[PDB]
Amino acid sequence: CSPGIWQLDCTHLEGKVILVAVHVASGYIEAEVIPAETGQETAYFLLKLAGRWPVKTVHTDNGSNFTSTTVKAACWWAGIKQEFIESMNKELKKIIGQVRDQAEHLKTAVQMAVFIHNKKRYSAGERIVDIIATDIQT
Amino acid sequence: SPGIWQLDCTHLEGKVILVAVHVASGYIEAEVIPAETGQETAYFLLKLAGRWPVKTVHTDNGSNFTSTTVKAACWWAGIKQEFGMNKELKKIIGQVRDQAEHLKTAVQMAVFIHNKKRKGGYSAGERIVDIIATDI
Amino acid sequence: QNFRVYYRVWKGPAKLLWKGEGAVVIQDNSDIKVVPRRKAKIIRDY
Amino acid sequence: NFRVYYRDSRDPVWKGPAKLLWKGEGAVVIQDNSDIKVVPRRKAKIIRDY
Ligand SMILES: Cc1nc2ccccc2c(-c2ccc3c4c(ccnc24)CCO3)c1[C@H](OC(C)(C)C)C(=O)O
Ligand SMILES: Cc1nc2ccccc2c(-c2ccc3c4c(ccnc24)CCO3)c1[C@H](OC(C)(C)C)C(=O)O
């Protein structure tokens, strides 16, 4: 079921930092292109995520940005436990590559690719709402 | 109602908070942006649309909302734009404002508070997922 | 593949007719016109 | 309930959640695990849980 389990990752692309959240159960994606691979940025991301989804647990690496105290603060505040497969991340890279030339800015390509990924079919966008919904309703 | 949203700009502390309300559920997304531009508005809309099945967006005659960048985003995704919980959000931001350094942090705190709050009688965060889920 | 051109401070969407070496011929309301290629971006739909 | 994050030197790194014992004009007394500690108010981030 794992409705509250997410995974957080940093990709580097075109000397920029894409931050990616995967809802493990559904395969659904959120991504944001951030100016620095900092704990501040990671934590502000996590807040946005948590205000939108029931997030119980976040899986991350030993990234200095993820072991940062700002992230810890966010987690404690919102009641997220932090723990210390990644095909949805690699697929995202692929799609970005595919659509990259369709848009000027990398950020636009990233969000295009997220949209493509979540909507493709059934879909991850549907699976997540279904999962979260069944968990509230039963 | 499933797929109907409303978009608004608040100005606060010489900053531009951009707010999306899912009209049916009362659910909120907000982002503090550096400029009240059409580029920024449109990039917001893309993020929103990749996450929710959004059919129609209600906005004002804001130059940022009548901007083609926004029009482009709408046409690209599925979205009809119409031209013909926000006030509560402001209140909550005011309440929590001093708890955080940056306005953006206060805004996201307030969004979280708003979406998770109940009337004990479900929360907006729950109502939206329920609505979207029952649809499809 | 439905393509939308935004053209020359930007105008659109206008309907794709023909795209050529250095310009693209297009129209929306009734006014057909030709604009040089690089400032009349073409973005498809999903 | 209240969590204190603090810098207890120049600034290697903010130190993890510590319990607030007392907050006064120029200082805060906190307990980090077993250890009572005193830091200036200005080196202390005090956040209330949701
Ligand atoms: C600047 C800062 N600096 C910090 C330094 C050390 C520890 C936390 C921060 C925090 C902080 C982190 C996580 C939170 C916070 C909350 C309230 C207030 N501050 C924070 C509730 C939600 O989660 C913050 C906040 O800013 C970021 C979110 C950009 C890091 C803030 O504006 O206070
Ligand atoms: C720079 C620009 N400049 C513009 C100028 C005029 C009109 C649109 C843009 C667009 C544009 C708008 C909406 C879209 C786009 C897509 C691909 C490429 N560009 C866009 C698919 C999703 O919807 C864009 C895009 O950038 C923003 C998202 C910051 C606006 C882009 O990176 O090409």
Residue numbers in the entry:
A (entry chain B): 56 to 139, 151 to 187, 194 to 210
B (entry chain A): 57 to 140, 154 to 189, 193 to 208
C (entry chain C): 221 to 228, 234 to 271
D (entry chain D): 222 to 271
Copy out sentences from the published article reporting this entry, exactly as the authors wrote them.
HIV integrase (IN) inserts viral DNA into the host genome and is the target of the strand transfer inhibitors (STIs), a class of small molecules currently in clinical use. Retroviral IN proteins consist of three well-defined structural domains: an N-terminal domain (NTD, residues 1–50), a catalytic core domain (CCD, residues 50–212), and C-terminal domain (CTD, residues 213–288). The CCD adopts an RNase H superfamily fold and contains a D,D-35-E motif that binds Mg2+ or Mn2+ ions, which mediate DNA cleaving and joining events. ALLINIs promote IN aggregation by stabilizing an interaction between the catalytic core domain (CCD) and carboxy-terminal domain (CTD) that undermines viral particle formation in late replication.
Here, we present a 2.93 Å resolution structure of a minimal ternary complex formed by the IN CCD, CTD, and the preclinical lead ALLINI BI-224436. The 2:2:2 ternary complex of CCDF185K•BI-224436•CTD(220–271) was crystallized, and diffraction data were measured to 2.9 Å resolution. Four complexes are present in the crystallographic asymmetric unit, providing eight independent observations of the ALLINI-protein interface. The complex has a pronounced asymmetry, with non-identical ALLINI binding interfaces that depend on the nature of the proximal CTD dimers formed in the crystal lattice. The ALLINI binding interface is composed of residues from the ɑ1 and ɑ3 helices from one CCD subunit and ɑ4 and ɑ5 helices from the partner CCD subunit, along with the β1, β1-β2 turn, and β5 strands of the CTD. Each complex contains one well-ordered ALLINI binding site (site 1) that has strong electron density and low B-factors, and one less well-ordered ALLINI binding site (site 2) that has weaker electron density for the key interacting residues and higher overall B-factors for the CTD. Four well-conserved CTD residues interact with BI-224436: Tyr-226, Trp-235, Lys-266, and Ile-268. Trp-235 contributes a favorable π-π interaction to the aromatic BI-224436 pharmacophore, perpendicular to the plane of the CCD dimer interface and the drug’s planar aromatic pharmacophore moiety. However, when in complex with both CTD and BI-224436, a conformational change is observed in ALLINI site 1, where the side chain of Trp-131 is rotated ~120° away from the CTD. We have also identified a new binding pocket in the CCD-CTD interface that is occupied by a molecule of ethylene glycol in the new structure.
